[PDB]
Symmetry: D2
Subunit: 371 residues, 4 copies
């Protein structure tokens, strides 16, 4: 019912101008700041967060489906990253300074982004080279972040740093004016996901400390769990959209006297992918039903969805034949190129499988009964 | 929730004696009739069905997990088949005779089984050779059914038949007592030992009140029972896979090779983490489906084919991690699990038949297609 | 062996300047005509073809590996297409006009391309809309061809056409000069940048001697060229996959994460060992096929679909091991490799069409079946 | 031509009585000793080995196809194991005692078998508990071997042992009369592959030493490479046989108005498996063309074939539907149960992938050109 109202709100906010902003963002290969401002103004982040310090997984999942329906990794990932930075601030931001930047972010007045990954420490955030040092009642933050999505338009960056004065990982919020944003990378896909290296050599007040030394990894893991749940939801919705488009093609394209849908090998392949996509969507509902954000569950669902998504898009692109390979005839290549980011961005398959494995429990009694 | 009370009831009924009966049933390759009687006497079918004509998918799923935890396809499948035949009677059985047979089945006083498959028409139930003909205010029933699981112990068989009085639709479902059928010698099978399956020869007459579903409603009646069955198979797979993963992890954490435990070998660890993530996804999906609170033919078809294919991979990879020991019948039971799981892609609807059901309800997206071209 | 001398010749022709032309072709997204001229001038096509009407599969395969080593679908595919059109002329071109065009193509004086695919009939070449009609001792040729690779630089197009003088078989192959066709603007494609592909509009007349294959022999002529092409695609995939595995292993042995190099992470190591074993198997299979010394339509179909599907997996998994860097176009070329490889399952015959060819020649085993039942 | 004569010889030796011996062996779940004696008497091992100390891979592969055609893992594996023990003796057996037992084995007068695997050290043969000690000009050999195929009928066992007097691994030939063969195991499949534990507590002459301490692993690896090439050949032939039987079923079984072969999803699935089985067979010809037994190539081809074989048999069994699951209606279950041994017996996937990985070479120059 609060969820039915949230869905009603998403249906009002995700209108024809959002679809138009998405299409233009794809053509320009840049994130439209007006989307976050529009979602903020519409009360999307406000209705999602309400007065809770911890996220409502049901609302998180419904927003992920809305983003996924746009079939644009850049747009969807961009919004979800902003929202995941909000999740870090809501749970870990104690100062009035942080609660105010968090409120600005919920309103869509400030764009937030994550500064975790580096050239050396991409998957391993423990080997972070970015340093945080206490000086003049504030902090000195120095380092380079490799992949900072939304950095060309962000107002604040959630920087993962290693404290010189002290595990040892901390999170510090740094304003955009105090960082050097490099030229955005030319990437394989996800055009509107403006990603660039960020060079930091500045000072920040003590109030800008999001998570103190020895708590930074818990804070970034919380945001990454929030992000992983969203990526899984976005994959489920974008895969459903791709299956539906592919089916429309299959029912109109005729070859060897029959439509493609009448060719049983293609029909049953699609039915298998549909069944598996439906399973992922039902699983997300099932996870939301528990009403808690769990790090291992988020890791598990995101890796499974990223690997399924890759397959769905590859097989949809295959069914479009030659036309699928022609950029001015179909957009399948763009979908396929965007989806390839899923297994790497937001945590690699291996890192996520290590997190799942770490919490797996043996059954000694059952093993005793089998031997 | 009434669901927490149902779980509490399942925890009471699925006791150490049930575990022992399962083990004995495996050794004897015979279904233990006492399990259905026990579940009936315990109020399991009664609490699941209550006064509803249509099933509570949450309770259906919880019972499937309890059955799945036993890691025995014969035991789990046999119970689910009895309960799916109850689902057919609850929704389609109109006569006082059928409602009484149905009540007996809920009590565990009568064992029901399904006689759908034939030598010719296995997957295609429209091409059933078994005939039903109106005679003397009743019905003549003649035919042979090939894969009737529980037939050696059943009291009534839900027979799918083609009406000769009607024009081909034609399909009907008729309840036939055990005494009025000839059950053949049970088949030696690849696995699922306690799932007593045999051919059933029928040449009999039954009263009009034995008609479960009249000509042209028979396929809907059997599809309803099969949807109920498919949801249960998926839950049994999710639970049995979880049990196998847990046992395999215990083996991995004790077995040492090349100076490390198997769990310390990253290639085995990540492989198990991927299987775990996928079995978890299936379990969450079953909860997601149950929350919708309705039994849908296509959803049941889609979850059972997915689970069957996943379950085959999980058991094969768990068996592989047991190495040579996995191949020794008196050292480990992994081979039995693996042989049992191979039935999942065929029994209760083949992958292809279930993918055809899924495909039949798939809808094109014209607006999105207009945007891509 | 004449094969060792052919390898020696390939080693001389595939020099640092060829490598540089490849790089420039990638940047410009234009096929370098000079490569075909260079290969012709070097005696590559001449040594491959000698005086044979039918191809030497060993030399075909060796040339495919040389092309594959460049890790560029456009460059490799463009050369192979020119050479496959030579295969059609060598076996089917009877007139002095065709033998001269064929000799020019072996010298690298004339670039040949294939005009088979249409907007309607892409995979099904029996439903070609392009028509051929006898007129004034020659032939009228009218139609549109959709995917003509090399058409912006070709001198002659091998056009698959349907004869209106004959009864539907009907299919013919006719050689049409570049000046007598209208080549459309090349398509922007997902990958294979230097593979200049465009639609070709035809409404012209040609002499009788331009007839490559008369009505009812056209499908055999195009299938012959496609079989030659498919064998080459498989060899190009085997070589390009080996190059990708070698580069990825260098990255794995230098890149450190969680205190170890990537190669020291067992899950990545075994994954690469499995891909290596499978690419090795494909390379050995190509040698095995070449030893048979004959070009077979079904064997070419079976090896190309297998290789295309294997190659997609190899490049996707190599790209994955490059992590974020794999996704950055100015840091690594893995994305280009991956985008190029996606063409393999569609260009030169889709998986489904090739599996239909394989299936058509599959033979049942009656004696074994009698022993199993 | 020597190969054409070898094929001609195989066609004469693999007759109706060999097919009858196979069928009876399956029913009895025991290896028919008369098969090895018959193959010996026919000159099969003699023609294969000639006067060479190193195997002719072409002849090795042709014999593997003959064995594979029988569709019986027990029979085929049994013969190949005998022949692999011959390979160890031919290259490593220096004493007249060993050359004579080797000649007896080629004649089919003596059945040989391998005693490598143990309860603790299955995949890791370096951690072997079986000990070899020099005493009274001979050797004292003490230990237990877990999986010794053909042990109930063998005359000599090639025992992998760790020398107390001394890497440290050795191979020693022990006569059957000097070992305690346990009751054969009840196994998942491969019924006629009589496998049992072997308890050794005996003394042997110095002449019985096949490979001295520090050479035993090279000797067992040579035999295992010979065995792996044969397993790959057997899988290729048995998979071809299964595809052909499955196709006969598909062309006679009618469902939903069409034969199974007319159902495109099943047809294209079979075409894919056929294409892949043909690729494996061509690869074996390609490997034989190099005319050398290579440890890594044998490891690579066997693991690839074992994994393909599992898939082929599982999918053939699926196409037989309910009938496939009925033991008195079809033999698909037996094939499926036999094939499951391929990924474990003769080296596990992981051990074989470690051997392949160990010889993989990086391309530094190409990597320099990509970055």
């Amino acid at each position: 019912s609060d969820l039915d109202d949230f869905r009603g709100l998403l249906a009002k906010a995700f209108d024809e101008r959002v679809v138009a902003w998405t299409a233009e963002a794809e053509a320009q290969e840049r994130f439209p700041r007006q989307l976050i401002e529009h979602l903020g103004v519409c009360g999307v982040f406000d209705a999602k967060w309400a007065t809770d310090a911890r996220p409502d997984v049901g609302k998180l999942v419904e927003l992920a489906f809305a983003l996924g329906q746009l079939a644009s990794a850049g747009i969807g990932v961009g919004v979800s990253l902003h929202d995941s930075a909000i999740a870090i601030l809501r749970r870990f931001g104690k100062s009035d300074y942080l609660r105010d930047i968090c409120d600005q972010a919920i309103r869509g007045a400030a764009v937030l982004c994550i500064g975790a990954s580096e050239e050396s420490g991409g998957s391993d955030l423990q080997i972070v080279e970015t340093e945080i040092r206490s000086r003049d009642g504030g902090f000195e933050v120095r380092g380079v972040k490799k992949f900072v999505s939304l950095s060309p338009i962000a107002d604040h960056i959630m920087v993962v740093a290693r404290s010189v004065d002290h595990g040892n990982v901390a999170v510090v919020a740094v304003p955009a004016a105090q960082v050097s944003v490099q030229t955005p990378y030319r990437k394989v896909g996800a055009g509107p996901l403006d990603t660039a290296a960020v060079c930091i050599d500045t000072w920040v007040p003590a109030d800008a400390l999001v998570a103190r030394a020895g708590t930074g990894l818990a804070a970034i893991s919380w945001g990454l769990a929030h992000e992983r749940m969203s990526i899984a939801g976005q994959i489920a919705a974008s895969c459903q959209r791709a299956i539906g488009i592919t089916l429309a093609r299959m029912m109109s394209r005729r070859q060897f006297g029959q439509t493609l849908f009448e060719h049983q090998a293609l029909r049953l392949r699609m039915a298998d992918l549909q069944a598996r996509v439906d399973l992922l969507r039902y699983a997300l509902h099932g996870i939301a039903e528990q009403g808690r954000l769990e790090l291992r569950t988020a890791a598990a669902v995101k890796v499974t969805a990223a690997r399924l998504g890759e397959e769905v898009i590859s097989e949809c692109m295959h069914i479009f034949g030659g036309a699928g390979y022609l950029v001015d005839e179909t957009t399948l290549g763009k979908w396929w190129r965007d989806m390839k980011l899923a297994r790497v961005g937001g945590g690699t398959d291996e890192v996520l499988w290590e997190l799942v494995a770490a919490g797996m429990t043996p059954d000694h009694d059952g093993y005793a009964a089998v031997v």
